[PDB]
Design a binder for these strands. Structure first.
Ligand SMILES: [Mg+2]
Ligand SMILES: [Mg+2]
Ligand SMILES: [Mg+2]
Ligand SMILES: [Mg+2]
Ligand SMILES: [Mg+2]
Ligand SMILES: [Mg+2]
Ligand SMILES: [Mg+2]
Ligand SMILES: [Mg+2]
Ligand SMILES: [Mg+2]
Ligand SMILES: [Mg+2]
Ligand SMILES: [Mg+2]
Ligand SMILES: [Mg+2]
Ligand SMILES: [Mg+2]
Ligand SMILES: [Mg+2]
Ligand SMILES: [Mg+2]
Ligand SMILES: [Mg+2]
Ligand SMILES: [Zn+2]
Ligand SMILES: [Zn+2]
Ligand SMILES: [Zn+2]
Lengths: 97, 104, 81, 135, 91, 232
RNA sequence: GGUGAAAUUCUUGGAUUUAUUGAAGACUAACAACUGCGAAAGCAUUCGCCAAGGAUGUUUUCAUUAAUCAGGAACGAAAGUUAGGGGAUCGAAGACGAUCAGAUACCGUCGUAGUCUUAACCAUAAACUAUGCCGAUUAGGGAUCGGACGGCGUUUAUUUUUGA
């Protein structure tokens, strides 16, 4: 699963995404999300809450294999991040798998 | 002065080699520098072959062999007459000696 | 030896030395046209391709990369262009 | 007195002769180490310490070994040769062959030659020091 | 503007108790006042309360560890070996 | 030497009275399991049964070294000796079962030679019968008739490939077996022929052998199996 | 037991030796070579994980990005030092038995630090190829390790191409 780190950078440069928990939840409420990512050390209640919304919305969810510190630095930002949503793909092919 | 091109060790292209123990005085020498002899011998000396043959209970019998590999330091090499001093020109000759195949 | 015309070496001697040790460097690689059995299309493939090349139709493999020149599929034929 | 058996068949034993470079031991068992038929060493028979390991002392010890084991009913022996082993010489001592010949000459039967010298897969450092015995 | 050559944190003891004892105490004291990153929330706010208790100032979790460090090499090697042994034996 | 004893019996002692301990000994016969050809392998000695000391208890933990050539009446297998462990002693009839196998030392040194590559592996395995036993294996490189080059050396990548093939084949063969079936495969050296047939393509590897077999654990005594194998 | 030869030491309070079982620490014989890797010191039991490296192949990419270096910095055998664990075998110091006119040694039985490992210092060796680094040219030969290319054949497999 080493490829996903490089795959996300292209989406960041080309497409547009929203970071954080409140904004991802609002996008999932809007129903126009296509894929959600969840960090390893987010609270289990938050985990199950996000998965329950994803199950209602029929959108895929991916469990990142690292904590939120490298999840944050994997997007070029200088702060921690625990969850995120892909509002749209750019020139990448994330939705293929 | 250099007496030998190979420094009498045969080690060029590396820095270190594990040592070994001499089979006579229990000295430590590099494995490539020690003298190694491989020996194949019978269980019993040639005069006893018949005594074993007729004292066996398996009609014809073939006595097994014995294999040893002894290794000495140079100090033990020429005191046991395993190797001997050569001349200046004869030093640079690494061909094995021709064993006698006729024995007069 | 002791009398040679170095300006005009024999073609065998220039086809036999290393590719950089000749009088003037020249590549020893080539292109080729492959006859795919399933379809009638044409693909140009490097002799020393480092990547698996996919044909436009029916999506079949044509070669496997290796240390030197790529090896072709058994049920394939090629001509050097 | 002895095991009842027909005259044609013969019963087997095993002898473990330990021949080092200072002394020789002859030990006869019954195909297992639980029971020792007899044991004799060069030391009692000989009258000088240096001569305890001599081939002559080993042949003499083999003679009375055969004599002592003859009335027990055992009629044939297997031999199990072993050297000092470990960090030792691993070469059998001078009194090996002598005693072995005397065993064959006395009339005893022989079978299954073997060497049981113990060899290490990778041994600890050996006694003597870095310079060895300098004499 | 270093105020010290080599003594470091253990300069509060003045000229008492000997250099070796001050060095030994300083080496172990330096690791006890520092801050460590929380393993649950990820923030860098975890401090020692009692002799074997460390707590995070953000998620308010408290964990029992070593005397002067959150974890010990012996305990880490024992947790790792136990996990390896369990997973090979039962799976 | 007679004249070296100084303390003799020690601080203070006295001579003995009763000698010749051979008046109370007994002789027993030894049998062999079912697969082997000959059953009698020799005689054994033990003290006569008496009060407070039963004889059968002393004949239940003995081990014997018997060459496989004698058991099979064939001089080809003259280099393998096997161990037999005594379990139950019927009246004037000792019963035994398998306890191991091993090559002779001299053949192994005759096989080991300079300027070739030797392949070695080991693996533990358990049978359908709850026996936990370990296997050793041996192989050597094979010379080609038309070689001019002095030395035959294999590369470590094939060396490990061979090691993996050997381990997988031995585990697959020994996965589901019993002692009687495995020994029936041991005496004709069946395992080698599959090892060689599987590995010829990577490299020849002549002289494929199983060096030795030893067992680590055993279940309950299960006298029924012993009587099943004995007394045919 | 050990020695040119003795003694110190252990022994019917069963020495030494024979077979089976258990525990502890260190080390990987033979294979092992005018053979491999690393800046050197150095590196050899199996397997799993992690990052790193040389060489070969290339009708990929940038375009002088380079060579040696006063001071400066990283590494640096063995022995040695400061704190824990471990402590089988040898063995500095030390205690005995012999030789000798003497023997605080060479020979033999014991034996502390040390020999192993974790966290930190020390920066010296016949650290030797007694031969500084980069670049160009100069003679014949045959071996050999890694990659690539051509060819007549043998062997062999759910077999061809591959592997030897
Ligand atoms: Mg080099
Ligand atoms: Mg050096
Ligand atoms: Mg003696
Ligand atoms: Mg001298
Ligand atoms: Mg005893
Ligand atoms: Mg090895
Ligand atoms: Mg090699
Ligand atoms: Mg300088
Ligand atoms: Mg050191
Ligand atoms: Mg200590
Ligand atoms: Mg001494
Ligand atoms: Mg000692
Ligand atoms: Mg040290
Ligand atoms: Mg210097
Ligand atoms: Mg230099
Ligand atoms: Mg070819
Ligand atoms: Zn020596
Ligand atoms: Zn096609
Ligand atoms: Zn926290």
């Amino acid at each position: 699963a080493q490829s996903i780190g490089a795959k996300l950078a292209l989406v960041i440069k080309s497409g547009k995404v929203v970071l954080g928990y409140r904004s991802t939840l609002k996008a999932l409420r809007s129903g126009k999300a296509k894929l959600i990512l969840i960090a390893a050390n987010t609270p289990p209640l938050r985990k199950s809450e996000l998965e329950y919304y994803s199950m209602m919305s029929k959108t895929p969810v991916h469990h990142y294999s690292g904590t939120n510190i490298e999840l944050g630095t994997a997007c070029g930002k200088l702060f921690r991040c625990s969850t995120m949503a892909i509002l749209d793909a750019g020139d990448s092919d994330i939705l293929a798998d | 002065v250099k007496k030998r091109k190979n420094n009498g060790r045969n080690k060029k292209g590396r820095g270190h080699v594990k040592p070994i123990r001499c089979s006579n005085c229990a000295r430590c020498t590099p494995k490539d520098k020690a003298i190694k002899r491989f020996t194949i011998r019978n269980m019993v000396e040639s005069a006893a072959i018949r005594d074993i043959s007729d004292a066996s209970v398996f009609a014809e019998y073939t006595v097994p062999k014995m294999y040893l590999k002894l290794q000495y330091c140079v100090s033990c090499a020429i005191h046991g007459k395993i190797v001997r001093v050569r001349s200046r020109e004869g030093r640079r000759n690494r061909a094995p000696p021709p064993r006698v195949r006729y024995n007069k | 030896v002791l009398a040679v015309d170095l300006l005009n070496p024999s073609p065998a001697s220039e086809a036999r030395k290393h590719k950089l040790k000749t009088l003037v460097p020249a590549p020893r690689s080539f292109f080729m046209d492959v006859k795919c059995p399933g379809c009638f299309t044409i693909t140009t493939v490097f002799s020393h391709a480092q990547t698996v090349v996919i044909c436009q139709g029916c999506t079949n493999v044509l070669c496997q990369p290796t240390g030197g020149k790529a090896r072709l599929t058994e049920g394939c034929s090629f001509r050097r262009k | 007195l002895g095991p009842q058996v027909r005259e044609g068949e013969l019963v087997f034993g095993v002898a473990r002769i330990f021949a080092s470079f200072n002394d020789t031991f002859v030990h006869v068992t019954d195909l297992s180490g639980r029971e020792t038929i007899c044991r004799v060493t060069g030391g009692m028979k000989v009258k000088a310490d240096r001569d305890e390991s001599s081939p002559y002392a080993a042949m003499l010890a083999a003679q009375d070994v055969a004599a002592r084991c003859k009335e027990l009913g055992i009629t044939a022996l297997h031999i199990k040769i072993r050297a000092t082993g470990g960090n030792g010489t691993k070469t059998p001592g001078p009194g090996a062959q002598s005693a072995l010949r005397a065993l064959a000459r006395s009339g005893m039967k022989i079978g299954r030659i073997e060497d049981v010298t113990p060899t290490p897969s990778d041994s600890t450092r050996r006694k003597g020091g870095r310079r060895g015995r300098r004499l | 503007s270093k105020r010290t050559k080599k003594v470091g944190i253990s300069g509060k003891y003045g000229t008492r108790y000997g250099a070796s004892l001050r060095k030994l105490v300083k080496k172990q004291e330096v690791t006890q006042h520092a801050r460590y990153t929380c393993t649950f929330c990820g923030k860098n706010s975890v401090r020692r309360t009692a002799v074997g208790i460390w707590s995070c100032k953000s998620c308010k979790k408290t964990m029992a560890g070593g005397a002067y460090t959150v974890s010990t090499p012996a305990a880490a090697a024992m947790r790792s070996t136990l996990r390896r042994l369990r997973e090979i034996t039962e799976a | 030497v007679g004249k070296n004893k100084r303390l003799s019996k020690g601080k203070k002692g006295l001579k003995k009275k009763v000698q010749d301990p051979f008046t109370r000994k007994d002789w027993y016969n030894i049998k062999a399991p079912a697969p082997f050809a000959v059953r009698d392998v020799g005689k054994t000695l033990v003290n006569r049964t008496t009060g407070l000391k039963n004889a059968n208890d002393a004949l239940k933990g003995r081990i014997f070294e018997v060459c496989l050539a004698d058991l099979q009446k064939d001089e080809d297998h003259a280099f393998r000796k096997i161990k037999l462990r005594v379990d139950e002693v019927q009246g004037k009839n000792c019963l035994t079962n398998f306890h191991g196998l091993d090559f002779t030392t001299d053949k192994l040194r005759s096989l080991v030679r300079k300027w070739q590559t030797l392949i070695e592996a080991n693996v533990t395995v358990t049978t359908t019968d709850h026996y936990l036993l370990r296997l050793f294996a041996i192989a050597f490189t094979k010379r080609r008739p038309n070689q001019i080059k002095k030395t035959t050396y294999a590369q470590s990548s094939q060396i490990r490939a061979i090691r993996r093939k050997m381990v997988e084949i031995i585990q697959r063969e020994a996965a589901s077996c019993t002692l009687h079936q495995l020994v029936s495969k041991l005496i004709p050296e069946v395992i080698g022929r599959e090892i060689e047939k599987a590995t010829q393509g990577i490299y020849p590897l002549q002289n494929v052998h199983i060096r030795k077999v030893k067992l680590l654990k055993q279940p309950k005594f299960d006298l029924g199996a012993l009587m099943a194998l004995h007394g045919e």
